[PDB]
């Protein structure tokens, strides 16, 4: 392998963003000119807050992925105080940004981006991995305007780490609120919310606070605005179903075939999405 990288191998630049346990900073590797988004984690804080399982899962899960719709973990290293993860730098930011910028998507853009998310989830669930925090904030856009999903510390790798995390309120599935249990279904729920959000401009469950959002979720209290692309409404209704075993994409619903075969995706070529030019605003 290459020599372990070190802080002194890079010129660190702008902070991209800041979380409770990490900071992502853009970094230029002196020896190659390459730019990376390096996620930097203070070891003390991770230890104090019992987060080693999560930091260990993020590295381990990202290390196992090898597909263009995910952020790549290129390297890791550490000094006495911090850990460093060398990630892809997605130049065009998060999908959330793009949703806020251009407002709601026309059907062509909705379809294209929905198809890349479905195709990514198919890859992920095939490896027996659940994301658990799928939302537009963590679906990045690369330079060529294809998706790159990130944020895997909170993921779950399935059996043959059970039910401790709950993602962003607006995307939380009913089964997380009623059971102590994450399943592939929960990602498919979040997918339904994301499709609704691309079309509508806002997510389907909204209120003043998290308690009120959760009450709406368990009662399935949401509505479609009037011009909502009909086949997309049909797809969303087949995902935002309280019975987790009855969501399109689930093993009990015969898998990703039926989901990919929905009318909404009739014009999609599923075989080489990453090779296709994305529609442009
Ligand atoms: C986690 N943050 C919440 C708000 C901004 C950021 C978005 C989620 N996110 C982007 C990440 C990444 C990138 C970011 C790209 N723009 C960002 C802005 C703030 C924070 C991170 C990024 C990137 O270029 N490559 C990434 O993996 C990222 C990496 C690990 C865990 C979460 C990550």
Swiss-Prot record:
Catalysed reaction, written as an equation: L-seryl-[protein] + ATP = O-phospho-L-seryl-[protein] + ADP + H(+); L-threonyl-[protein] + ATP = O-phospho-L-threonyl-[protein] + ADP + H(+)
Give the E.C. number(s).
2.7.11.1
PTM sites of type N6-acetyllysine: 227
Q: Does the keyword Ligase apply?
A: no
Residues recorded as binding ATP, renumbered to this chain, are 20-22, 39, 88-90, 94, 137, 151
* Biological processes per GO annotation: actin cytoskeleton organization; calcium-mediated signaling; cell migration; cellular response to epidermal growth factor stimulus; cellular response to insulin stimulus; epidermal growth factor receptor signaling pathway; extrinsic apoptotic signaling pathway; hyperosmotic response
Query: Taking every annotated instance into account, which residue ranges of this chain make up the domain Protein kinase?
Result: 10-265
Activity regulation, free text: Homodimerization regulates its activity by maintaining the kinase in an autoinhibitory conformation. The 14-3-3 protein YWHAQ acts as a negative regulator by association with the residues surrounding the Ser-164 residue. STRAP positively regulates its activity by enhancing its autophosphorylation and by stimulating its dissociation from YWHAQ. SMAD2, SMAD3, SMAD4 and SMAD7 also positively regulate its activity by stimulating its dissociation from YWHAQ.
What GO molecular function terms would the record report? 3-phosphoinositide-dependent protein kinase activity; ATP binding; phospholipase activator activity; phospholipase binding; protein serine kinase activity; protein serine/threonine kinase activity
List the induction conditions. Answer: Stimulated by insulin, and the oxidants hydrogen peroxide and peroxovanadate.
Q: Where is this region: PIF-pocket?
A: 41-85
Going by the UniProt record, its keywords in alphabetical order are: Acetylation, Activator, ATP-binding, Cell junction, Cell membrane, Cytoplasm, Kinase, Membrane, Nucleotide-binding, Nucleus, Phosphoprotein, Serine/threonine-protein kinase, Transcription, Transcription regulation, Transferase, Ubl conjugation
Sites where Phosphothreonine occurs are at: 277
Q: How does it sit in the membrane?
A: Peripheral membrane protein
**One GO CC annotation:** cytoplasm
Q: What class of enzyme is it?
A: transferase
Subcellular localization:
Cytoplasm; Nucleus; Cell membrane; Cell junction, Focal adhesion
Positions carrying Phosphoserine are 164
Signal peptide (from-to): none
UniProt PTM:
Phosphorylation on Ser-164 in the activation loop is required for full activity. PDPK1 itself can autophosphorylate Ser-164, leading to its own activation. Autophosphorylation is inhibited by the apoptotic C-terminus cleavage product of PKN2. Angiotensin II stimulates the tyrosine phosphorylation of PDPK1 in vascular smooth muscle in a calcium- and SRC-dependent manner. Autophosphorylated; autophosphorylation is inhibited by the apoptotic C-terminus cleavage product of PKN2.
According to its UniProt record, in which tissues is this protein expressed? Answer: Appears to be expressed ubiquitously.
Query: What assembly does the database describe for this protein?
Result: Homodimer in its autoinhibited state. Active as monomer. Interacts with NPRL2, PPARG, PAK1, PTK2B, GRB14, PKN1 (via C-terminus), STRAP and IKKB. Interacts with SGK3 in a phosphorylation-dependent manner. The tyrosine-phosphorylated form interacts with PTPN6. The Ser-164 phosphorylated form interacts with YWHAH and YWHAQ. Binds INSR in response to insulin. Interacts (via PH domain) with SMAD3, SMAD4 and SMAD7.
Primary role? Serine/threonine kinase which acts as a master kinase, phosphorylating and activating a subgroup of the AGC family of protein kinases. Its targets include: protein kinase B (PKB/AKT1, PKB/AKT2, PKB/AKT3), p70 ribosomal protein S6 kinase (RPS6KB1), p90 ribosomal protein S6 kinase (RPS6KA1, RPS6KA2 and RPS6KA3), cyclic AMP-dependent protein kinase (PRKACA), protein kinase C (PRKCD and PRKCZ), serum and glucocorticoid-inducible kinase (SGK1, SGK2 and SGK3), p21-activated kinase-1 (PAK1), TSSK3, protein kinase PKN (PKN1 and PKN2).
**Family of this protein:** Belongs to the protein kinase superfamily. AGC Ser/Thr protein kinase family. PDPK1 subfamily.
Q: What is the protein name stated in its UniProt record? A: 3-phosphoinositide-dependent protein kinase 1
Q: Which organism is it from?
A: Homo sapiens (Human)
